[PDB]
Design a protein around this ligand. Sequence first.
Ligand code: SF4
Ligand code: SF4
Lengths: 621, 621
Amino acid sequence: SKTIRSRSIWDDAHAMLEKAKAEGISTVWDRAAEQTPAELGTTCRNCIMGPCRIANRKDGKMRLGVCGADADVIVARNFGRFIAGGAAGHSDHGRDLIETLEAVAEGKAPGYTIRDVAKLRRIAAELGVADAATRPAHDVAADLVTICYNDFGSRRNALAFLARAPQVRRDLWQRLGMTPRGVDREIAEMMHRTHMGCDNDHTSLLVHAARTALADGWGGSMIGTELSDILFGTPRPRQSTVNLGVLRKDAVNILVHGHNPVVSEMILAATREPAVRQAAQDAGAADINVAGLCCTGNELLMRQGIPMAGNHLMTELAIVTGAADAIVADYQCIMPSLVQIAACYHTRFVTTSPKGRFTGATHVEVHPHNAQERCREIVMLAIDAYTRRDPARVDIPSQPVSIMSGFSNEAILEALGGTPKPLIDAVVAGQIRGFVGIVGCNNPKIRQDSANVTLTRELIRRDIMVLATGCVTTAAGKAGLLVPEAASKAGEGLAAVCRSLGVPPVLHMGSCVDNSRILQLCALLATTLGVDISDLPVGASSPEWYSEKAAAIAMYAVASGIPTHLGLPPNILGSENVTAMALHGLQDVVGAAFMVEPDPVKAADMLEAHIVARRARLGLT
Amino acid sequence: SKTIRSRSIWDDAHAMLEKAKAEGISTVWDRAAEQTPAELGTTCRNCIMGPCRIANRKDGKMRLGVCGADADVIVARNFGRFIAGGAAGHSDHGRDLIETLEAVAEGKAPGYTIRDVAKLRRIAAELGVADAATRPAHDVAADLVTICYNDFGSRRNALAFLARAPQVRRDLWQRLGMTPRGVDREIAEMMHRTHMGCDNDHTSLLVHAARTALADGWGGSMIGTELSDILFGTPRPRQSTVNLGVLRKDAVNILVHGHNPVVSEMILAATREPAVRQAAQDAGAADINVAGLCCTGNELLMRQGIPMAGNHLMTELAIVTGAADAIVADYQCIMPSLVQIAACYHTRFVTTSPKGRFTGATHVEVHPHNAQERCREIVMLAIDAYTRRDPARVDIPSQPVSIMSGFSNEAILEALGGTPKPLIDAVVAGQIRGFVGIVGCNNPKIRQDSANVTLTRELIRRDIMVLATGCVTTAAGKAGLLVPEAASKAGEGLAAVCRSLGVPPVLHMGSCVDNSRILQLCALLATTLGVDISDLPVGASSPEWYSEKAAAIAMYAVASGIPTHLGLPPNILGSENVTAMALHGLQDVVGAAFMVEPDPVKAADMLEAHIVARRARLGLT
Ligand code: SF4
Ligand code: SF4
């Protein structure tokens, strides 16, 4: 009920921003307003002959760096390191899941099992494990771990999951020098290329940026997605709820934050132990309430139906409620300001990873061999914090909103009858004109979820099915769009298909790493049709992205032949040639390009224009 | 004979800077003067919630980033990415040498052999190859390649060459979480840690920075050094010459630039073919003159006695001579301004690597399977450029200066009688008070080689033997310090030892990657003495460093227990805690620390003060 309303579209955010304003708590929006004044990407710090800056000064000076690099090279090198940082996040995510499966195969991970033995055999046989369908599971698991570790090596010509792509798409990557060879190798070669006096050509630098992101989507992310299903079960459609109202004043509230489900799944298992449940009652709690934040919340939402408290810009406001008893975090997108805001209350801020360290946090390092023991200790710290909660400062806003989740590729095919042919024929008729994966973050520079939900409504109204992943899940869920009754907000053709299957017009497909499910579905549809991915009526969008990670997702979507839209532009506008390559040049190279547009309705026209063109290229109506 | 004399201390540089000034050619010093105005390291660009800047403004604003990161985290994350970029350069260097040995073992590299079969067996047996001393060589080579590739993997607990370090040093790394596990893995985890909301603790970020650089020195660099000896021969002491006078007006001048000897060794072999030599005579050339630049020149200097034309800030002035007929470059430290300056003349600028691309250059991509064929084509392009040379613009300055090179650890031990005991007893007596490895680059912010040669004279005068690598070789060589007669410029004790062995007081130990030879020697002396590397009277210095690569070398020297001096400071002064950790905090952790001092005489006192303290700790005189 102030200028706070210009920061978010949701009521629970307005209620907590007013509560933070009264209690004198600075939020991300406050710090974003101070850092309002390097956005052109024409500043280089790669060596101490600089730092250099490229300008169009009237004197003609500062046109080149000290080494002689121009604006094209400097912008390309900064952009490549931007993509590499995003690929490195998904790289360690998949690597931690590889190490967890190996620990299960060796019997050294108490509490972890192989939840989906059927998927273990199918994935292993697909990647080349001999007799994967009939050998003992732990032996099959060990061979799959070897293949995955070799993709984090330096001897392969191409990643294992790259075989899912159509043949014409693989033959295109090979001719371009774009085929990803190793998940860690392409990250290291990107840092090598952007060193002084190495790669000084903006075209080859951008080609390697696509190759690095392809090592993310078809490598690190896809390995992380498929091993999570093997270790924790393949997600199936199920109902749950979102927004801050999922917190309970009468229960211990444990907020899991981060990305890796290896930690959050064992936290949930610890809260269900009888001795731990009894201890929560001794503290006077009716139950232990686990709620999810960001991607690790998407993980528990897809496989366990655990309610989600919020997304990126909601994590601070979740502690302002005064009901957060513990924040369990591993790594990625955990703003360090959470530690200071948790100090204002009783909230116990716990970190679990050697990579996710925070100055002033309670560190309980979790590993596969002691996860079951350490997570029990973590839940006890939450129960203890419940005893010290300040009752006069608890104000859980709003009421929870119903959602439906768990739409993996296996679940989508099961609703279709085990075959993509019903989905194809619906696209042939003209009921579903195309698919668009809406993915990405929030960003304080844009009213929270305003562009995410707007584009989602515009697309489903034009008979375009939306595949939601990442923090957009919270945006779509709180808009009432993740239920089968949301078909009334879709066009006539899409609504008829949704009511036939009992599914919503927006399918939740998981966390950010689960964007590999979209690649898997796009590769499966292009394979059955016999065409390239650049021929399918597909699209991708990140209207409110912020991280290096979303840029890497957008990059490997473009490199795979999916026209990708970005709300805010990357720090590349200081070079017209790099800008012309990203926006127009890539269209000839890989069959897709980036789209920068802050207007979500206009972006719906551009996404639909690409889709109708690809429908024409298929000779469809 | 102007203010040009304030840019370099050498006559050949003054002659070419005057020649470039007359011909209207802008040099690095010209571009350095324009970029005189991010040096504090308190600017962050890791996401598009920023870019943010940390300041001490009177209003108290801009103290944190949009995510809430303070000055400690931002400076630490920028410094970690700085170290990672340097480690990535040595990583790809070692990886290309692994791929070359594998191609030799498979018989798919025409022109390449195993030059040092004896060293192949010793290295392989050291790293764990079974029956490495008696099995066929190509089978032994294949097993060694497997071990090296696994160090570029993600399954090891520690790199293979880490066994050379003393046990107490390895046990120190393991307790600190500093043990390097994989060359590419530590680079990827550094980019993951520096993502938003991952590692937000300046201590753990710096600990991983040391671990990343240790993966360089004991991993990428050491693999690259030892495989180069296996493929091209172990260097032995030999005489050669330096400075621009090594170019011949009566011969075809081929300037090899970059780092990888896989390319420059085959260029040299092509210039010695009879049909190619005959073609140079047909063009009117008396011979084909190959000269080295930067580290690839150090490679050919150590193993072939090929004269060196110059170092970093000499590469542009080498083309101004008008006698450069071809520049053959692979990657690293090849300033893109060379392409424009070569265009001013007849010089043919050739690139050979997929990673080292330059807009406007003649690209002849070289690989092990076609190196012998492509390099012959490259030399023919140089002979052709000799026919188009402008005679009125050729002015080769100065006269060549004699040097002695090829002092590997194997050559040092051979001069000592096959045992380090003569070297130890000389340090016990007080003749050689300590060893200091002078390494690093040039930097336009400092008068060229003024601090490099000054410190070299100060150290040898105080009876401290200097081990020279990298671009400091050109500085020491042109100062007449790389000959046995230079003992007259050393103290009484050091001069007596040098005249006994017939060696100079400054030992040339190779290129930048050959800094692993210094680690190998420091580990060997600490092992025979039974103490830690932090107990040996050793030191390291980079008075005129510029690259991410020298910072990684300085970092893994500190992490190995060697007090390291830097002329210019890294971009870390915006955080006192990070500065206090690098300068003082690391002394308690790893037994050494960084030393920032622009005064070379003062740095000689600080290096000697550390050495005399370690001599006292050993109870020596
Ligand atoms: S790499 Fe070149 S442009 Fe970048 S800081 Fe160094 S000299 Fe300047
Ligand atoms: S990571 Fe934090 S400090 Fe860096 S640009 Fe993003 S919001 Fe600013």
